[PDB]
């Protein structure tokens, strides 16, 4: 079970010039393309090994389609500045995420297309891929245009057609990478916070994909009281890192146990403090 | 609500090596604008284009043409040196831009240019009305009048019928385009026919006045006319018949 | 690799009748719009319809219907109840994103549609027309002829116009007309 997602981001810099558009694309937790309006290149660019192999026709198509998008987005910044009657002093920010989801059988599960302005829902396409949800009045106008232009019929044709055809090609092409499970390599650390309390941190490193569940147990029983989780973070090599901590009474370290569930673990893992 | 795309001029005749500017303005705030020629067997060929104010780009047949997009509003086409090759129908076009990628082209009505070796081949039409055949009337109960404009160059003529002083349109056929008096010559003079059909009784009534009218677009004042015969300027030439109970 | 092909230069159908105008496109680009334009005798160029790549097959719009077949790259235009008005040059076209992302156009070369009246009582014959102004100048008129029969020439430098449909709206009566004049025989012409 896997996904493709594009993330477009377009920022106004009134005076400093034309908007900065930046597009990136993902298959599961792995980036594979990018476009930056300010780059020398002026091309959609590879960012995984397994896409480099697409031919010049692919790169040209992807380049032009995405330039065409950056251009719409550029106009859209001024149309929305006009909807909200904001002055042309301020930097504003359209962001679009869309993509699809296939099951292990390789068939369509869901599609997505969601736009926002200044960091807040603007307009979304519903799971019906046939109707939109405006968040405010500006979006309600967009919504009439897109109802008449039949925009939804366009997204749907993409998300149920070319999005999955190509997600599937990318998973075959990248199978040694995109379908690897890398299990988490786990240690535990101990930080006396006081003469009475101490912090057990449970570490998980080098794992892919990023989906992972770290829980604590005391004397063999669910424990969430006094527990932290960090935001899962990237290693830079295409793998993930995340820790979980609990504050415990000193002397009582040996009753707590870190539990680790990840896709590439046949059995869940288990750590205990060892001094 | 909006004019759309406006093009000037509509008719023009240079001498080889003379220059001119076709002007095109659009009132719809469009970002892209275009200049096409249109020729028998070639359809629509783009000459130059512009995606924005200040910028312009070569199309499919730039050689012989320059352009300026000084303002968003207008797009100028310049012939620095007129060739006979450039005899054509020029069509300006605009398109909204990336606010509407699905936008179709909007075209103006077209400038009809004829470039000629010498402006002494420019000739105004000779217009003649021909009366209905007294045989037509007593076989059909109808009277086809015929007009005939001949001897003209360029092929820039608008023809019209005028019954008792008012333009008419009912009962009128006019050839789609003028035919060549000598189709083997690259400077043949043209002829155009038109027919006005009315009831026998209306033609037989001598209170009824028929005028055939031809608008000819020839030389402006600014062309020289070292010749002797009347300078062939833009002009109207007409022929007329009264009704007849003969 | 953007072509549009119309393939029919010229097609002719009697009025109150269906006509289909074939159009075939060739692109490798996946985000195209196809168009049709009409150009009547007047010259101007009129937008008719747009089908986008993602579009459904059929698109009705008054007497005008279109049939989009992506598998075979055809976008054929049908006219039901053809009226002579429909007589014209019809242009298929297509837009794709160009280098800078701006959509730009490729036109077929045009189909020329002639919709010709339904002459429910032919009486073909010729007539000699005398000049209004006594030149002995004379023109010959072939009129009231079949819509199927056709015009050609016999004794070159002599001229013959094409056929020309004329409507007396008052009388509810269409007529065909071709004119002939020499410089120098009213009959022995049009053969």
């Amino acid at each position: 079970s896997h996904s493709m997602r594009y993330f477009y981001t377009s920022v106004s810099r009134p005076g400093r010039g034309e908007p900065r558009f930046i597009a990136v694309g993902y298959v599961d937790d792995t980036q594979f393309v990018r476009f930056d309006s300010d780059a020398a290149s002026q091309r959609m660019e590879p960012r995984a090994p397994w896409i480099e192999q697409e031919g010049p026709e692919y790169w040209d198509q992807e380049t032009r389609n995405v330039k065409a998008q950056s251009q719409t987005d550029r106009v859209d910044l001024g149309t929305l500045r006009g909807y909200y009657n904001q002055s042309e002093d301020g930097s504003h920010t359209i962001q679009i995420m869309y993509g699809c989801d296939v099951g292990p059988d390789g068939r369509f599960l869901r599609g997505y297309r969601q736009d926002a302005y200044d960091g807040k829902d603007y307009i979304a396409l519903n799971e019906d891929l046939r109707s939109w949800t405006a968040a405010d009045m500006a979006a309600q106008i967009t919504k009439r245009k897109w109802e008449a232009a039949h925009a939804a019929e366009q997204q749907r044709a993409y998300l149920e057609g070319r999005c999955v055809e190509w997600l599937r090609r990318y998973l075959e092409n990248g199978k040694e990478t995109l379908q690897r499970t890398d299990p988490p390599k786990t240690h535990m650390t101990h930080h006396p916070i006081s003469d009475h309390e101490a912090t057990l941190r449970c570490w998980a490193l080098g794992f892919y994909p990023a989906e992972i569940t770290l829980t604590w147990q005391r004397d063999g029983e669910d424990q969430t009281q006094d527990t932290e989780l960090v935001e899962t973070r990237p290693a830079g090599d295409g793998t993930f890192q995340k820790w979980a901590a609990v504050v415990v009474p000193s002397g009582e370290e040996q009753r707590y146990t870190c539990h680790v569930q990840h896709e590439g673990l046949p059995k869940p893992l288990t750590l205990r403090w060892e001094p | 609500m909006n004019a759309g795309v406006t093009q000037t001029p509509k008719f023009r005749v240079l001498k080889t090596g003379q220059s001119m500017t076709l002007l095109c303005a659009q009132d719809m705030n469009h970002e892209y604008m275009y200049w096409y020629r249109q020729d028998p067997g070639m359809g629509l060929r783009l000459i130059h284009y512009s995606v924005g104010e200040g910028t312009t780009a070569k199309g499919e047949v730039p050689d012989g043409y320059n352009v300026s997009r000084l303002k968003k509003q207008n797009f100028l086409l310049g012939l620095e040196s007129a060739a006979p090759s450039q005899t054509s129908v020029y069509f300006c076009a605009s398109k909204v831009g990336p606010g509407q990628h699905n936008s179709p082209l909007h075209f103006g009505n077209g400038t009809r240019l004829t470039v000629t070796e010498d402006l002494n081949k420019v000739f105004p039409p000779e217009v003649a009305v021909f009366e209905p055949s007294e045989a037509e009337i007593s076989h059909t109960q109808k009277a086809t009048l015929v007009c005939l404009a001949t001897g003209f160059y360029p092929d820039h003529v608008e023809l019209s019928w005028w019954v008792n002083g008012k333009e008419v349109h009912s009962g009128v056929c006019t050839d789609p385009q003028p035919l060549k008096e000598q189709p083997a010559l690259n400077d043949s003079r043209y002829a155009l026919s038109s027919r006005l059909r009315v009831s026998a009784t209306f033609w037989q009534d001598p209170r009824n006045h028929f005028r055939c009218q031809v608008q000819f677009y020839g030389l402006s004042e600014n062309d020289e006319w070292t010749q002797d015969r009347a300078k062939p300027v833009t002009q109207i030439v007409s022929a007329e018949a009264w009704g007849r109970a003969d | 690799a953007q072509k549009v092909t119309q393939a029919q230069t010229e097609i002719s159908v009697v009025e109150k009748e269906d006509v289909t105008l074939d159009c075939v496109y060739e692109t490798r680009d996946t985000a195209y719009y196809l168009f049709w334009y009409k150009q009547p005798p007047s010259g101007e160029l009129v937008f008719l319809i747009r089908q986008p790549w993602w579009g459904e097959q059929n698109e009705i719009s008054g007497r005008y219907s279109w049939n989009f077949q992506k598998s075979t790259s055809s976008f054929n235009f049908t006219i039901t109840a053809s009226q002579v008005v429909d007589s014209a040059v019809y242009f298929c076209a297509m837009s794709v994103p160009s280098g800078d992302g701006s959509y730009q156009f490729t036109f077929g070369k045009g189909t020329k549609l002639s919709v010709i009246p339904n002459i429910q009582n032919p009486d073909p014959a010729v007539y000699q027309l005398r000049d209004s102004k006594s030149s002995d100048k004379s023109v010959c008129l072939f009129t009231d002829f079949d819509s199927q029969t056709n015009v050609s020439q016999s004794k070159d430098s002599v001229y013959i116009t094409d056929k020309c449909v004329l409507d007396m709206r008052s009388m509810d009566f269409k007529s065909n007309s071709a004119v002939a004049w020499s410089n120098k025989a009213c009959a022995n012409a049009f053969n």
């Binding site: 251009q71 719409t72 925009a151 | - | 996946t30």
Partner: peptide, 10 residues
């Protein structure tokens, strides 16, 4: 592969 650019803006 990216979606085609939308036929109309916002």
């Amino acid at each position: 592969v990216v979606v085609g650019a939308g036929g109309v803006g916002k």
